[PDB]
Ligand binder design. Sequence first.
Ligand code: ICS
Ligand code: ICS
Ligand code: CLF
Ligand code: CLF
Ligand SMILES: [Fe+3]
Ligand SMILES: [Fe+3]
Lengths: 522, 522, 383, 477
Amino acid sequence: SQQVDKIKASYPLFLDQDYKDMLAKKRDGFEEKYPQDKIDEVFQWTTTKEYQELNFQREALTVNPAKACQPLGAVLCALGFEKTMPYVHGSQGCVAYFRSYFNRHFREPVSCVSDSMTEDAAVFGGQQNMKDGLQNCKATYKPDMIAVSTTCMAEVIGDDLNAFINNSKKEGFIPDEFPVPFAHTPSFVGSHVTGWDNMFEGIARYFTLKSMDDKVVGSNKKINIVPGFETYLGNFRVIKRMLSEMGVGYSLLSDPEEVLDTPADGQFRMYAGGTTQEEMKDAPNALNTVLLQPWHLEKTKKFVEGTWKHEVPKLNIPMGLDWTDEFLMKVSEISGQPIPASLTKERGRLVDMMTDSHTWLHGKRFALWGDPDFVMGLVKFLLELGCEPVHILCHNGNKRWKKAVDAILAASPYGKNATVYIGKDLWHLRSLVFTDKPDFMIGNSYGKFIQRDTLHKGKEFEVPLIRIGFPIFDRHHLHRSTTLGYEGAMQILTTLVNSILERLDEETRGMQATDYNHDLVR
Amino acid sequence: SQQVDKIKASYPLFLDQDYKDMLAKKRDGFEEKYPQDKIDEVFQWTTTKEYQELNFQREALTVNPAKACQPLGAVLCALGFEKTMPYVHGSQGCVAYFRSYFNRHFREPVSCVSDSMTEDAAVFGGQQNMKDGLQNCKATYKPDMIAVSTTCMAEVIGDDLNAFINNSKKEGFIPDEFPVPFAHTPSFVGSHVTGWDNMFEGIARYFTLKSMDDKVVGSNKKINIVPGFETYLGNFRVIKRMLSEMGVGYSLLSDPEEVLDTPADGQFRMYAGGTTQEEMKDAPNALNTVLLQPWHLEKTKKFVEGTWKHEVPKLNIPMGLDWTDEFLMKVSEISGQPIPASLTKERGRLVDMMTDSHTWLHGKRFALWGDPDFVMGLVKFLLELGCEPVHILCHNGNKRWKKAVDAILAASPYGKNATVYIGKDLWHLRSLVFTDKPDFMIGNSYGKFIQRDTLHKGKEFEVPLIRIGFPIFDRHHLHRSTTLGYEGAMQILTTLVNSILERLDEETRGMQATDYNHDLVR
Amino acid sequence: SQPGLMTIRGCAYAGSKGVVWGPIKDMIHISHGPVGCGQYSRAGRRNYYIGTTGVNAFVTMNFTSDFQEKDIVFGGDKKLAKLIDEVETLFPLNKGISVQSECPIGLIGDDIESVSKVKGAELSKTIVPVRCEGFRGVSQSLGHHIANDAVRDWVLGKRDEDTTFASTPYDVAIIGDYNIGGDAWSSRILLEEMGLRCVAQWSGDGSISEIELTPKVKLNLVHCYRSMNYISRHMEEKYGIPWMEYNFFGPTKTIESLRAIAAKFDESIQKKCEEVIAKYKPEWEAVVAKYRPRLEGKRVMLHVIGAYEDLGMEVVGFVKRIKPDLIGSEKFIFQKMGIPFREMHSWDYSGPYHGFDGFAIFARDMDMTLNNPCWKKLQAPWE
Amino acid sequence: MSREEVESLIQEVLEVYPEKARKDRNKHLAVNDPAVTQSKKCIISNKKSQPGLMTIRGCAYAGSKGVVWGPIKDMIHISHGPVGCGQYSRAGRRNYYIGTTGVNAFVTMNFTSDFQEKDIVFGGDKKLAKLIDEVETLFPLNKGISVQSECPIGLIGDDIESVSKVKGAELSKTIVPVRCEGFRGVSQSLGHHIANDAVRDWVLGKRDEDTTFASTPYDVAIIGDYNIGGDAWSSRILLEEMGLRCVAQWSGDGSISEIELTPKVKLNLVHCYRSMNYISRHMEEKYGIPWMEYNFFGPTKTIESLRAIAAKFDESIQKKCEEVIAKYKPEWEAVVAKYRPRLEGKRVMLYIGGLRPRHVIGAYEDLGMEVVGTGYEFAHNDDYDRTMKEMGDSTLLYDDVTGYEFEEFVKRIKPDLIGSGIKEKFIFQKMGIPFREMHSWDYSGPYHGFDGFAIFARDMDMTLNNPCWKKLQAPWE
Ligand code: ICS
Ligand code: ICS
Ligand code: CLF
Ligand code: CLF
Ligand SMILES: [Fe+3]
Ligand SMILES: [Fe+3]
């Protein structure tokens, strides 16, 4: 039943007595449900250390992964180029999923096509699909360039992307001079960030490998910036803003910021902004190339150092205070441009916020997960705040990255209770936050179930989630935030301290029970 | 007792059993406390409509006011001028309180002096205090200007600020040429915004009244901006940024954003930035003057129109979509500068976010309070979002402002259930949110005590507080936020929609009870 | 599909794991293959259910074999067997496992059927291998067919020789309702108020035992015939169970469907149907009286018409000529052109939309979307 | 620094003042000589602030309403006058209490007469009477009302005493007029005195003829603990563990009934001498109740205070005191073991109101830290008499320090840590000197007692050793 003046959505509509009775009748009569005592005892068991030991013995089953597959990152990389259509050679369901994932994170249209490879292609290969798809995509969406990646089906059957595109050009399906860079992006290797790396290396190779004769390092007086897999528009914006304030000529390669943030003015813009083909062609002439997320830009680093002959600096992701300082100082040294007074003042303002919030930040225990570079930058910043990361999870991390993060943790007294986990999922992390409870989690939307589970154990066992990372589906417009530089550090600090203060306010809101500590001033 | 590995602060230390037994013994033995049954009965009675009728019959008692006194606004206005010392003629307790208030809101040093009037001056006046205080302040803190307001003791005694300052100059306590603008700021008239208006009018008069013969309107091709009482640094910053994007010459008179945001670089800067005396002297040469918060800049408006001969445009506070559009169009008309493409795109992105979040925002009920201009801007933006303000409270509002807000509500279908209250305090609003429960409150930190109260009635009756306004004491660095322009509208929208989504996530987190609606995607 | 063109069309895996098998709460569904498909489909559909996630229900979870290169090169059958052992260890209260094949399973020669049979015999568990590799077929429709075939072959006939269930003449089964935002619950309350016993309801809020009990019902009420027409015809042929389509979208469709369903039973059921219609008439009438003025005349670009006409909205069937107020037939592309896009089930954020209770929510959402001021702010005043 | 160096530093700082201000301020700065007993010979206190010098002092209203009367939870305190004073003082002091706010407790609420111009011109006594009626209607469970006068009340000739008498007689309610107008005196100190006199005149003697309270030989009253962050509670649990019955708490978590029961106790344990010595002396001369000063800052002072208090009673209380000390010895010894190595040798400069600048020295020394500078906003010469012995030789003493003076002192002394109020905090954080709020305990605490010592040590360590203090210089500067 519904009152027209106070219409109820599913919650709390299904909490009404009649719906509760109906659901109880369904469960009792036909669901053959386990008794509630059995369910409670099994849940309690899943929160224990013995269950954690069984859980960490897993070698074939993955539960609630913290990663995606390569073509997702390939598509995100392709989106950052001007009038470029991401093109995944393979099966259409993958493209539907990629578009949905990015739509839900960005709340924007996401352009990507497939050549709809099917059983017929599963036998004979995907060459005809490639020819037809390139022709139709160019004719229909009129892109300047088509960036080709693959789904796992095309990788398994071993479709030759180079040969397929060359045959499409030779047979007239697409103009011979039309740019069709490609990358093999197998989903059974690495993760989405590996796909981003592979796609970027493919595009850079396509536009520069054969025309290195006339290239001179430093002749265009610019610094190439490769952002990697990045889902905060504010990070692209802050990098561009800081380089502009410094007076440093730069070339942001793969800039998807505009196309993921088009205005609502009654017109649909398929393409907006993006790195131009001239920029990528001219990239070897840059002074140097800076990789913002080096731990998943290794293939790109190898190509840039070996072919462009750029001395790519050993730089961490510009996250937190020290690493933003190091990034700025390296850029200053490369470009010869001094760090200006505005950036010095911004750094001082971040330090001022740190001093204002240190008492509430100090000693707070965090579980956290995400991509390798983001996770390590967050760990570094948390150490800078006097916080204690305890459970550091990177599902798509590797041994070398774990060793680097362990070195970071050893450099700080605040990392002494921290463990780094690679190849572990969010079910592992659920066990960890039950058995060694942190104060907060930091991660993407998938953490909300863990928090739910912890709350089932008890309000005193609940671990609140702080949403930083990708994807964020259950909040709006957080993709507009910044995590890089002093601005990103300021935003992260504000989020952390105010999450702590909101949790404290909730814990002390009980009239005549805990509200003696419900202070007006914090 | 304390475990050295896990030390507890007051919460939850006083939840330990021994402390609970101690407190129960204290209450039972010596407090002569009313029985808990009687306390529950009276609380429930305070939540009722009969109590609300008694509460709104108050004529002499004010409970939890939502306003401060004039000298606080005078001090804030004085802080916006370069190397200016706020100087409050009167008793020192007022200055101690003002500095503490602004320290807690901004988490920054706040410079202000008193001439420490005591019982001796209560019968003889504070002329000697003025002479000695001006001399001491100039010698010790070396300001370029001393801006004088009054506490209520000086206003009741009837100290003539002009004569006192003139006698201090005539007797050599300060140089004749040293700028000492003054304003009478009686705390028993108006509120803090009135004090800001009086202080600004005093400074502008001091610097322009006697030099008007050589002034020509529009000769410097600039637009004066008077922000009024403003405690979000982002609002100053966004107005400056938007005017600079337009290529519009401007003078922000009373700009305190630098002195309230000094870096932590090992040096204390008592003064930073601020409006120069040259800018104030050249202000009459502007094309026009725009008042950002007209409903408390009436004395300033009268002076600027009657003396500077500036045809001050009838403009609302640039909050939300429509009023930012009107502000930008009026600025474009005055300056002759077109609105640039960047501002058009920013507006389109605000509209896009509105469209993305309208399903969660539409029909949400809000009780809100604050200063007149801020409150009406917030009401306008909520109407633009499809939200329903229900309880609009402005303690320092007046009848004409209420008429304007009623006209705004009548022009929208979403204002039908809205009532505007002027002269009512936060106890009135507590009754309102009990009897006509909104979904949320939008207000300053004092609203937290209302939320606590509502939670005591029950979780289904709790009204969560959204902290927008002044002062915000229980969260960190919210004073850096923005509420003006498209940027401010986007920030407010994000705060509102994510408050709604956070509340929904909290209500649907119950395992096997309400978590059928604990959606990953929102 | 036509290669090189954008579409939101899913694959067979999206039709089998996403639509048919995933909503079954007390089963564990393994996305067999690389990590992508299970992650993108995880909790992506709002198939509402009641349970303790991770203990006795597993819908919002992502179980996967996370195929690496060595799994591709040497096969994943041993990995699948070890995974089933680990599933048994870590989730002892699961009532069955399904193995949803992703693309590589169909191309590397893996035999999930033999592994399913051996492990299911060993553990005395129902392990359902579904060959729903995404490259099969052109959409999710073939995935629906494959998932239905798996239901018939491995689950549906499990109680063929059992006779211990106590049947009543008023036994119905709700098939093909995926309980999007609780739609199936909103239908089930009306059916039970008619005096019917909903013995089986799947996939939405569905349990494996309910699927097993479906062959014991007197009537099969099919909501989504598109995905669940193979199984309904199979049940009619084998067990002699008649099946009919029902439509609870809007008061007119709901009342007609309730009368049609009650016409299949005795006079007592018809009398209760009349009682239910009488009980709910004032509520949907109040909804109409409130919201039809705000929506009368607005055009919808298009189980389709009913609720829209109950609110006075004209339905139509290039977009700059019709000037539609709403598209019912790529949400963000339409949104960028200033046209709201909404659907029949509240896929994204809201619901239920079915039944009398869902009609109020649907009307409120229609008014909120169509009359929101945001749609009127596309043109800047200076442009 | 040697004594001559501190004298030179004082003179160098003083040289920027005009001759009148410099001559005045010279008498309020001193170099400590721990042997000297009469602090008048070296320093001067409780004088008027110099105009325009950015003093840190508050007013009499802050001393009376904000300090003494406001914490009393079951009374309703009216900020009588214009809106400002009550609003700036609302819930800014962490005087913790147990109650149902708005029903039976009212501490964090702001009740005010909100004076307008007509109230100023024609008086506000009728408005006050009407306000009292409205308070009675809307808060029936209040157990009394106080009327804290703000500055205009004493300048417009309002008679709040006559209104208090009439309305209190009519309503059978205790209504306490307090003439704590901000212009009275020179600081919060006279506010303390006025509030104490109001307590004596209107509340304390209410049960003089009532002999129905069952008294015990172990009846004590905690006077002058305002329960900042729970400080008083952390003290109370020790005294109750010692076998004493704490009849009254003044005024943190205080109720009007325990104030009325205070004349029945056997001992008055005064923590803040400065704010409550007046009422303690009055109670001694009227009822014969002895009073003693005690200090629960740090384990050393706490143990000494517990033994000194227990010596006022029979051997059973002394045995229980020894048991309490033995029970808590391992906990604070573990706290010391954890935190003293991280804090040994660090130097502290303090500037707080009336009691803590000398009271917290022992807690700092229990962690291996040395207090090199201390000072008071509003202490009297008797407070400085108790500070010379407690501070190191050739250490800085400053009375009503100006912001400029304290900044210059900190620049030349360079302490590792400063403890002062919210007005100094961000100044000294900007300079990169770790700062701890010594009024609100930086929204932490309690710091009293053994339980409070663990929190205090954790807080001092987390602030002094925070990584942020190593980052104030940019690596390219
Ligand atoms: S199964 Fe089909 S796309 Fe028939 S794949 Fe799809 S829950 Fe749609 S129009 Mo999502 S053929 Fe069902 C459908 Fe209809 S997932 Fe749902 S709404 S009635
Ligand atoms: S009452 Fe005094 S200024 Fe003794 S007015 Fe002040 S809660 Fe201070 S040094 Mo704030 S004489 Fe108490 C004090 Fe000390 S408010 Fe508190 S910390 S121990
Ligand atoms: S059509 Fe369908 S969704 Fe596509 S793969 Fe095939 S079953 Fe799956 Fe999977 S991991 Fe990523 S998303 Fe693919 S490339 Fe492979
Ligand atoms: S010294 Fe003390 S705080 Fe000052 S007024 Fe006097 S009692 Fe009060 Fe009050 S309303 Fe504002 S803050 Fe003053 S100017 Fe008057
Ligand atoms: Fe969007
Ligand atoms: Fe600060």
